[PDB]
Fold this protein.
Amino acid sequence: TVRASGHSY
Amino acid sequence: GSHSMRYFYTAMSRPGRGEPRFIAVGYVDDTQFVRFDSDAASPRMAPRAPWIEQEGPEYWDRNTQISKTNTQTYRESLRNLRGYYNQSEAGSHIIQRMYGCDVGPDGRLLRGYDQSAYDGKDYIALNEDLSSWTAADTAAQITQRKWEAAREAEQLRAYLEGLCVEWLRRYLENGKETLQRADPPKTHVTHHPISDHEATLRCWALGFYPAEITLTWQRDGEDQTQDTELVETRPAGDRTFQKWAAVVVPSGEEQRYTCHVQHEGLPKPLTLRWEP
Amino acid sequence: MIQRTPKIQVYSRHPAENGKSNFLNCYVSGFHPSDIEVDLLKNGERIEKVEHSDLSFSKDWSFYLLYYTEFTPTEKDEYACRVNHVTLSQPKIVKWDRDM
Ligand code: NA
């Protein structure tokens, strides 16, 4: 399963 | 054996041709099992292997939601990185990210990964400690300070030690008849004369899974590494892989050459010679 | 900015035997950036329904894709793969070599 959407670069 | 799960993200800008495309694919070992493509008519995480089809709607909706959010975040990230490199608005650029976990045969975490590239060059990577960063340049130092301020390493570490390991174990069990089955290569040696003085011996490996394999030529028991031509392992289309190694030998010395095959589907390593 | 030109291998899924159904493969790898155009040629003419794999990339960030279609080899017919990419002045054509 995917990882939680993270912070923009 | 040991196993891995990896997600591969590609976000590609295309100025004048719409918003940046975001593609995600998930693998277990060398088996792809999900994909997401923001260019699709109805973008959603979709199955790409049969053993994932049984997951419920809550699964697919979480994976789809995260990917649609990722579509937007990676669009913002391409704008940000263009600024970090003082780049024009007219150029096309790419962020790539691969992350996931390796587990041992007992299912315990061996290590986690989270690495990013921009236009094909290392940008920033989570260190093996799952708590510090390696920035490739002063532009990536900006992302690092942004990610330290949001304690991003802790969120990735929690994922890499938690969900990643847990779901990988679940997939391996649900797909055990393929993911935990190693198919040995079918092997054979071919002989193709080049001249009156030399011929090519080519050692074939076909139909094997996973892709990891060792093919080597020996002359009088000594490895011929610098004289062996190895093609890149290639997919057959049915989950299995193909590979060959070639060596050019003097006519009449064929029997001094042996091909050696190592693969985990093989009860024991193979030694092959040309059988004329 | 650095670009990488694609590697190309053309081959059948199973060992080729005339009159028997099989799959023709064109594997393109090692290239960057990701836009590529790949066509399968039967005696020079583009074959229509050619599927391909989902875009992925290797550990060195270079991309790879498998383009494939069902076919039935014959002794007469000649197959090939034609690849264009930003790194190539002109489309590259690689013929299916049967003995390989
Ligand atoms: Na070109």
Q: What stands out?
A: Residues 3 and 9 of chain A are 16 Å apart (CA to CA). Chains A and C do not touch (no CB pair under 8 Å). Residues C 84-86, 88 surround sodium ion (CB under 6 Å).
